[PDB]
């Protein structure tokens, strides 16, 4: 039972035309709380938790795989969170969806590592996407990155440094470094069970 | 008192390094690049890198004379002539080298000084980052490896805040194949129990 008409019925959580609201996302939520976005909201357990945890922040999740954003809309439907919208769009469309400074933070969780050299350009921490984040947040923004992948994290650290961003937080073992209020992602729960360390970085723009 | 073998081996352990500021090419006899290690220890590292790379001039610094003696002995057993050693504190680096005279600085398993009041004693603190810039110029780099998650985590932020560019970073050095890697004494000990060894390379922006 493949369900795509499901996303049309819940068009109040899954905005089927997000480009229309560029510059006007404050009207979409009804308040001017800061908008934080997650670029890879696979299954929406994280975004839902951060919403319930922080009612005074407006969360917008982005997902490319429609097979999995469906699960995300269901978690937002169950959590009854009213400060969560979801976009089934590609990260390259960020500048068509948000005006500079409309976004205040970007959350990156367990993104695809694309280990091969030819696929650096597809990594969500590559300078192309680093630019897209600068273009929607301005220089008053930050990136909150967590991943299990040593390769992707190692690369991301260099990529942040090369782009000129300031490292304000870095953990090389998140579940042994006490972080108050940490919402685990689906991928975080599984690789945590595996006893593998989870890396976390906070990176922000210089001003 | 006494018990110093350093006077007899004054050709490896330079007992007056401030005299040679600006003139270290005369101390070696060539213009091979000068790499320095801060916090040498028993000298296993500096000796290995010297024998491995005869075309680089290595100068190791150590504060405790009890342990630099072991370092001069390892340099004595190896036949490397491109190793000098200084029994001095990292602060006097600007009294020993002219800007641009040093090309790289090696930091291995430095003291972490975990509590906040002793941040200023850490060898990756902005004070020392300046001292390294002042002896290397903008053409220098730092090659840091340590077992300490705390110190590495801090150092990465410290490098970023100071404005240095991260060109290499390993969060598991013995699973990331590094070809020219010479293990330090402390590296061998913390390698036991499989603790991960972190490594970073940072260089100045231009
Ligand atoms: N360019 C892009 N735009 C949007 N989503 C993307 C993307 N590239 C990858 N993704 C999505 O990002 C997710 C990363 S894997 C799942 C991560 C999730 N935070 C978790 O921890 O469970 C995948 O669902 C993938 O399809
Ligand atoms: N400011 C300073 N100047 C010089 N040496 C210092 C120093 N602070 C600490 N040290 C020395 O640096 C060493 C740190 S322990 C590391 C030993 C060696 N690098 C190894 O990896 O095996 C100790 O010998 C300590 O006494």
Q: Which of A137, A124, A132 is nearest to A34 (CA)?
A: A137
Tell me if A64 CB under 6 Å of ligand 1: yes
Ramachandran sector of residue B152 (left: φ over 0; alpha: ψ -120 to 50; beta: rest): alpha
Give the Cα separation of B83 and B28 in Å (integer). 9
Of A154, A165, A166, nearest to B169 by CB-CB distance is: A154
Strands across the sheet containing A103-109: A84-88, A58-63, A35-38, A103-109, A142-147, A199-204, A166-171
C-alpha triplet A49, A50, A55: angle, nearest 5°: 110
- Asked whether the beta carbons of B140 and B104 are under 8 A apart, the reply is yes
Residue A152 near ligand 1, beta carbon < 6 Å = no
A155, closest residue in chain B (CA to CA): B169
How far is it, in rounded angstroms, from Cα B100 to Cα B22?
9
* Burial status of residue B168 (CB atoms within 10 A of its CB: 0-12, 13-18, 19 or more): middle
d(CA B68, CA B84): 11
Experimentally, how was this structure solved? Answer: X-ray
Check if the beta carbon of residue B18 is closer than 8 Å to that of residue B43.
Answer: no
Phi-psi region of A90 (alpha: psi -120 to 50; beta: other; left: phi over 0): beta
Query: Which range marks the domain in which residue B183 is found?
Result: 1-206
Rounded to 5 degrees, φ, ψ at A8 are -70, -40
User: Are β-strands A103-109 and A35-38 bridged in parallel, bridged antiparallel, or unpaired?
Assistant: parallel
The count of structural domains within chain A is 1
The one-character DSSP state at B182 is: P
Contact B157 A150 (CB under 8 A): no
Q: What resolution in angstrom units was achieved for this structure?
A: 3.1
Q: What is the CA(B13)–ligand 1 centre distance, in A?
A: 57
Q: Please, are residues A44 and A35 in contact by the beta-carbon 8 Å criterion?
A: no
Closest CA to A53 of A75, A81, A31: A81
Q: Is the CB of B67 under 6 A from ligand 2?
A: yes
CA distance A199 to A111: 12
Running DSSP on this structure, what letter comes out for residue A185? P
Q: Check if the beta carbon of residue A167 is closer than 8 Å to that of residue A143.
A: no
Determine the Cα–Cα distance for residues B108 and B143; give it in Å rounded to an integer: 8
A169–B contact, CB cutoff 8 A = yes
The C-alpha atoms of residue A143 and residue A205 are separated, in whole angstroms, by 9
B166–A168: do the CB atoms touch at under 8 Å?
no
What is the chain B residue with the closest CA to A171?
B153
Burial code (b: 16+ CB inside 10 Å, e: under 16) for A166-191 equals bbebbbbebbebeeeeebbbbbbeeb
Reading the block at residue A98, the tokens are: 């948000």
């Amino acid at each position: 039972p493949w369900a795509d008409d499901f996303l049309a019925e819940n068009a109040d959580i899954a905005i089927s035309n997000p480009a229309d609201y560029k510059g006007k996302w404050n009207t979409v939520f009804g308040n001017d709380n800061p908008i934080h976005i997650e670029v890879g909201t696979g299954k929406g357990q994280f975004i839902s938790g951060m919403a319930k945890q922080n009612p005074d922040i407006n969360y917008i999740g982005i997902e490319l795989f429609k097979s999995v954003i469906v699960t995300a809309v269901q978690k937002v439907k169950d959590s009854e969170a009213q400060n969560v919208k979801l976009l089934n769009i590609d990260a390259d469309t960020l500048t068509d969806v948000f005006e500079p400074g409309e976004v205040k933070r970007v959350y990156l969780n367990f993104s695809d590592p694309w280990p091969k050299k030819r696929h650096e350009k597809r990594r969500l921490t590559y300078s192309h996407f680093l630019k897209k984040y600068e273009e929607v947040m301005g220089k008053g923004g930050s990136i909150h990155f967590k991943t299990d992948n040593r390769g992707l994290f190692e690369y991301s650290l260099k990529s942040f440094s090369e782009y000129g961003l300031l490292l304000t937080y870095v953990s090389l073992d998140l579940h042994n470094s006490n972080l108050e209020g940490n919402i685990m992602t689906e991928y975080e729960e599984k690789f945590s069970a595996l006893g593998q360390p989870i890396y976390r970085a906070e990176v922000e723009w210089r001003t």
